[PDB]
Design a protein around this ligand. Structure first.
Ligand code: PXN
Ligand code: MTA
Lengths: 277, 280
């Protein structure tokens, strides 16, 4: 292998590249994808899938805190949480910081991502042994189609077409009253058209769907987004005081002001959405 | 076409496919004008991305609107740096601005930006704009008390011609030069890629001015793409009081910035809040 640290580049559309100098600790192809475990100088250990940046030890909280804490502070209850994806273990770690959470089911199609993340990325996945976590290797899409009505308080998609309308309708069916759906919603910079289409799809399925915005330096443009959906309008703005007071002292980024801030929409998003109303 | 990279401490790189249109070394710095497939025509200084036609509003709207919406008066504005023209374009959107002084050390930056980056610098012809090729640090040392409503520092990283722009004596002269109710703003690097500098800037400016508050936004061509600016003034909380008449004239003319974006950008991550406490 390489004597010294190499440039590990994610190339976007053959015309942008973002790279981190680091060592390859392990690379294999699973039946689903190429998995590359790396040791970066700037961010520590991390993960690519099909030569795209997924995570790293010191650029992960910015993804995981934004996916998890806005839904978990606002859902009427948080006893039962479903994560679709979650392979690196950072989403379930954030979800398990809340004492009210009773069960988290993680459903990840590629068992090699979980094994390799548990073996090398333990500094990100600190909650694998939490007796509330149940890890299932299988298709996340089939799981929500096959799950009971009103069985989960929160549904988090931690992965990325196969997330179509029928999938999101199952999500609404499987959510309990007062419950929250959330997922990544691509870049308003690098994937605007898909960004807007996802907002429109979730707005047609749920009573309210709101995008929110933050930073992932290793994703295309570094300008990333999420989508919150519930069947109560204005729920996204009303985190529970007691959940905020408990979570704020345990996280690196998220607080009551970041929570309100992230939902401010840039004029170009507001305009792209009103063009289609 | 070739990869044009900004390399960040031999650890991180950000590249755009494109072509080199012009390169020279001035008495101050290496100037690179490029065309890029992804963001059109841009500017590197000493191999650091400064600007591009389709990646520039995220920087220029953030530097300019929060101070211009909030200063008690905006008749006289001083811009230090800003050779590419985008900062003064944003400033000159306001009807109540009467004069904008742009003090740029490197005349070649203004000339190459006028020749090649006219699509960013759309306001060079504004009669209210006076371009002065000189050092910003010397300019505010010389300027009289209470002579400007707004000072914007549109400079680069702390290493080379932009270095003195991060020092306490410069910040003291800026607070001296500002009129009552006026506003200072600077780019303040990245809380991901330059956390120690970002927090030192917050601390030094917080000491000089009654209040200084970081604010956060996006610049995909800058290291991490997670960027920041510093608001400072002699009125605590002035950053939360943007004027409705200024917002209603500006919002229709800008791609990102609005009332909600203005208030959101000041939300501080826990690790910035705690990092300022570790500093004490
Ligand atoms: C919100 C922003 O426009 C406020 O202006 C600040 C300010 C108003 O004074 C405060 C008031 C009497 O309690 C004070 O700035 C004082 C600093 C600079 O020491 C300035 O307004 C003064 C103009 C109208 O000359
Ligand atoms: C893309 S524009 C960034 C700008 O900051 C300018 N600059 C850096 N240091 C100073 C200084 N001390 N005085 C005036 N302009 C500066 C650079 O020459 C450039 O136009």
């Amino acid at each position: 292998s390489a004597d010294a640290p190499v440039w590990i580049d994610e190339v976007f559309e053959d015309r942008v590249r973002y790279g981190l100098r680091g060592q390859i600790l392990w690379e294999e192809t699973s039946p689903f994808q190429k998995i590359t475990i790396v040791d970066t100088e700037h961010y520590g250990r991390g993960l690519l899938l099909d030569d795209c940046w997924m995570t790293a030890e010191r650029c992960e909280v910015c993804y995981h805190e934004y996916l998890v804490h806005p839904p978990l502070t606002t859902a009427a209850s948080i006893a039962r949480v479903l994560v679709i994806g979650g392979g690196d273990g950072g989403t379930v770690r954030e979800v398990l910081r809340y004492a009210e959470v009773e069960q988290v089911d993680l459903v990840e199609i590629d068992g090699r991502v979980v094994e390799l993340s548990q073996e090398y990325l333990g500094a990100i996945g600190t909650a694998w042994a939490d007796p509330r976590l149940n890890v299932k290797i299988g298709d996340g899409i089939a799981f929500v189609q096959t799950a009971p009505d009103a069985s989960y308080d929160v549904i988090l998609v931690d992965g990325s077409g196969l997330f179509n309308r029928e999938f999101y309708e199952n999500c609404r069916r499987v959510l309990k009253p007062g419950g929250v759906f959330a997922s990544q919603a691509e870049s308003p910079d690098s994937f605007l058209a898909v960004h807007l289409e996802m907002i429109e799809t979730l707005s047609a399925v749920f009573a309210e769907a709101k995008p929110y915005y933050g930073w992932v330096p290793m994703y295309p443009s570094g300008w990333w987004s999420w989508l919150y959906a519930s069947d109560t309008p204005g729920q996204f703005q009303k985190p529970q005081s007691d959940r905020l007071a408990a979570i704020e002292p345990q996280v690196e980024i998220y607080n009551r002001d970041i929570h309100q801030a992230a939902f401010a929409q840039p004029n170009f998003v507001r305009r792209g959405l009103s063009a289609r109303q």
